[PDB]
């Protein structure tokens, strides 16, 4: 046991030295050679109303017009951004829903929560009524996040510190990702769907592969539980947000943080993070009844999106980057542009 | 300007909004309470008796008493980090806390169970989300405590205790010990009650506590309190 612990410590020191050897220059010194972005003004366009409970998850569709949002009332609503009309209303058996996902093709949707079971609902049913298609059970913890890898397979994250890839047609988990010491909180799929990063309460993130089913890499630097994680539009980097009131951008090739986003007046944790289409700007939802935009290259605050009446819970940018939706516990989802 | 399909979609959205409003008004019609306590604290017996009077994850029990519906949420099986999802129960009406009154000399793999129960009660009471959420303490092992105190002294658990070995003084001291843990007496109160073989008395006490709270909530909502 002692020899194994000494070997682990030696490997950790070697990894630290290797990560430090690559820190030839910081992102700030390189980005100081470009002019800063001007003041970004985003005015709320649509004010979606109809929810009577706290919002906890939302996801846009490939069409960049429909967005599915989940609330604690047990009702999943698919809103139309352009007309603010409800397309469907899925009544959940367990009102304690915390995560929701919208498949790429939009034929199926996934949801989960404290029930420890992921429910899949089909929207293109010939019967005409949205009915649960498959119930993926087996998780010993609450479902924190889930995203559609493909129309056939899906990946889910549970509070039991282990994720699982479930096949819809089969219904049994094929790959089990283990290694996290804390409860996994959020997921984010890469553009190629081959690798995915997951953050947990252990103040560290892990990049895993789909087919291999092993931890491809690990990233550290956070001081609290990582609440949100998002992939960079290019697929070579990813941002993470924890309760330490600061975001951290990591690169899958450098194996270390590039730049930190923080401000003295910000003392509360972060709930959601999402990049833009071009990645030039980053958005982060905070608990002070608003969201903040940061410069991904200079970390300068680009703007503040205020108007939410409660803790900001989720935010998402359209696939085309036209507008950005933000949902909070106040039961209202606002679109900004 | 809206075309035929647009007007039809708007009408369907209005119908969905009406259905959602009706569902919300119907659900606002049921009280919500959160059950907490150790597995051996008698929660199972309380749930069984309350169901008679009327797998991993969280359990949801529904029962009506005096034309009043209740939703008991049991999260005991959710052995995970509570501070990351307990906030979901911010709007809960009451917190039914069950503690093992007789399990004061046993050992658990704090070493003692009473200290752990007190710590959990203090953490749930002083929680930032339960500043106003009322708590109702239930002692589901009063008979075992009466049968054990005659042989095993209470000093083993509370060395500082020096009162008489009678059951009344010991019960009063144990009650005051949990009552003093409330650091928010100005905004919230605790309703303590001793459970026994009888079950209707506990249901009546829960109904009265829920009735008191609904009253205080309505008073604070209309602007009076």
């Amino acid at each position: 046991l002692d020899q194994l612990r000494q070997e682990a410590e030696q490997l950790k020191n070697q990894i630290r030295d290797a990560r430090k050897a690559c820190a030839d220059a910081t992102l700030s010194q390189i980005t100081n050679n470009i002019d800063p972005v001007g003041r970004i003004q985003m005015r709320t366009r649509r004010t979606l109303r109809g929810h009577l409970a706290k919002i906890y998850a939302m996801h846009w569709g490939t069409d960049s017009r429909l967005l599915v949002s989940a609330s604690q009332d047990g009702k999943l609503i698919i809103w139309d951004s352009y007309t603010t009309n409800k397309v469907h209303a899925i009544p959940l058996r367990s009102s304690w829903v915390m995560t929701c996902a919208y498949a790429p093709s939009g034929n199926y949707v996934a949801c989960g929560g404290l029930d420890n079971i992921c429910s899949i609902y089909n929207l293109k049913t010939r019967e005409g009524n949205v009915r649960v298609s498959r119930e993926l059970a087996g998780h010993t913890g609450y479902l924190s996040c889930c995203r559609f890898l493909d129309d056939n397979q899906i990946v889910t994250s549970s509070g039991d510190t282990t994720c699982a890839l479930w096949d819809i047609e089969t219904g049994q988990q094929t790959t089990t990702f283990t290694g996290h010491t804390g409860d996994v909180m959020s997921l984010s799929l890469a553009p190629d769907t081959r690798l995915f990063v997951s953050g947990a309460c252990d103040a560290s993130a892990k990049l895993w592969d789909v087919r291999e089913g092993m931890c491809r890499q690990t990233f550290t630097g956070h001081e609290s539980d990582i609440n949100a994680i998002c992939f960079f539009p290019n697929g070579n980097a990813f941002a993470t947000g924890s309760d330490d009131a600061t975001c951290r951008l990591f690169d899958l090739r450098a194996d270390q943080e590039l730049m930190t986003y923080s401000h003295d007046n910000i003392i509360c944790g972060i709930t959601s993070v999402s990049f833009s289409k071009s990645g030039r700007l980053l958005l982060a939802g905070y608990d002070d009844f608003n969201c903040n935009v940061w410069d991904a290259l200079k970390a300068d605050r680009a703007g503040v999106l205020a108007g939410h009446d409660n803790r900001v819970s989720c935010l998402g940018v359209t696939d085309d980057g036209m507008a950005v939706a933000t949902g909070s516990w106040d039961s209202f989802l606002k679109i900004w542009n | 300007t809206l075309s035929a399909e647009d007007k039809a979609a708007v009408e369907r959205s209005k119908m969905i909004d009406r259905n959602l409003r009706e569902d919300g008004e119907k659900a606002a019609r049921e009280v919500k309470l959160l059950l907490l306590g150790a597995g051996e604290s008698g929660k199972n017996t309380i749930v069984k008796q309350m169901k008679i009077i009327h797998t991993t994850g969280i359990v949801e029990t529904h029962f009506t008493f005096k034309d009043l519906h209740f939703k008991m949420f049991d999260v005991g099986a959710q052995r995970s980090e509570r501070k990351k999802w307990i906030h979901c129960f911010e709007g809960v009406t009451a917190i039914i806390f069950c503690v093992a009154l007789s399990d004061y000399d046993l050992v658990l793999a704090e070493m003692n169970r009473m200290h752990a129960s007190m710590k959990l009660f203090d953490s749930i009471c002083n929680n930032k989300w339960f500043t106003d959420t009322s708590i109702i303490l239930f002692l589901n092992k009063k008979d075992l405590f009466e049968e054990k105190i005659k042989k095993s002294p209470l000093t083993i658990c509370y060395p500082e205790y020096a009162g008489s070995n009678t059951y009344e003084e010991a019960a009063a001291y144990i009650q005051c010990q949990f009552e003093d843990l409330n650091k928010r007496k100005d905004t919230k109160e605790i309703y303590t009650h001793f459970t026994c073989s009888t079950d209707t008395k506990n249901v009546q006490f829960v109904f009265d506590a829920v009735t008191d709270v609904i009253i205080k909530n309505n008073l604070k909502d209309c602007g009076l309190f």
């Epitope: 429909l66 | 007007k7 039809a8 979609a9 009408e11 369907r12």
Partner: single-chain antibody
Framework: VQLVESGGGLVQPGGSRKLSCSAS????????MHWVRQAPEKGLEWVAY????????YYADTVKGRFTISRDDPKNTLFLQMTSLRSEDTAMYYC??????????????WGQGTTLTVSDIVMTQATSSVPVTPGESVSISCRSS???????????LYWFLQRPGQSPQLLIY???NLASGVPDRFSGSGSGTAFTLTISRLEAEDVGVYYC?????????FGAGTKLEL
């Protein structure tokens, strides 16, 4: 999904008939119902329509005020009271489903209909009969009096295929979306008022009549219909 109509037969002009369509196999409440007649050797024609929850009911000028369309969601039954009958009202009345939401394919299912005998944007198809052998591609052209392209950015056009002894089948909706279950051989395009339905390779199953429908204004007009037979 199945629709069975009842009521009809021989009816004198001064008589009245209550046609009843029993709906089953789908959410009847959420799906509105349209009535479309088809006289002998004549094209289709919209009769009346009921919206979800009976919130909006519409009738055609040819039947406005004379007929009464009602609905029963608890019982899941569509009712049509026909008070007065004219010498030209004899036609097979078909009940059609229609749900309205972003991405919906209304008029997808057509009922079998019932036979009853009694003792506006203009749509026109260039060709009526186009004899062609199987295997060769086919093209059916259509023209609308008014531009169906709405400011929202879509064209309200529908194509239906009615085979001998079978009810119409939705081929393409909104001029660019292929109906579910229809072979990919069918394609639709158009511009402003000139539309075209193309078939890569005709087959025996394609023998039948192709009808067009505009849905920009609720008064629906159907074309004569282009017939294709080997």
């Amino acid at each position: 999904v199945q629709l069975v109509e009842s009521g009809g037969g021989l009816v004198q002009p001064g008589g009245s008939r209550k046609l009843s369509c029993s709906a089953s196999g789908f959410a009847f409440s959420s799906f509105g119902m349209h009535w479309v007649r088809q006289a002998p050797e004549k094209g289709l024609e919209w009769v009346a329509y009921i919206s979800s929850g009976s919130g909006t009911i519409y009738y055609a000028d040819t039947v406005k005020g004379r007929f009464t369309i009602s609905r029963d969601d608890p019982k899941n039954t569509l009712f049509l009271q026909m008070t007065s009958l004219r010498s030209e009202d004899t036609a097979m009345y078909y009940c059609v489903r229609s749900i309205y939401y972003y991405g919906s394919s209304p008029f997808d299912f057509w009922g079998q209909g019932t036979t009853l005998t009694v003792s506006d944007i203009v749509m026109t198809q260039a060709t009526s009969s186009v004899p062609v052998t199987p295997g060769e591609s086919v093209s059916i052209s259509c023209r609308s009096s008014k531009s169906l392209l709405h400011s929202n950015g879509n064209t309200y056009l529908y194509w239906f295929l009615q085979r001998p002894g079978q009810s119409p089948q939705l081929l393409i909706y909104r001029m660019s979306n292929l109906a579910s279950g229809v072979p990919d051989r069918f394609s639709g395009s158009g511009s402003g008022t000139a539309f075209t339905l193309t078939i890569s390779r005709l087959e025996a199953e394609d023998v039948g009549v192709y009808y067009c429908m505009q849905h920009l204004e609720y008064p629906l007009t159907f074309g004569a219909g282009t017939k294709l037979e080997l």
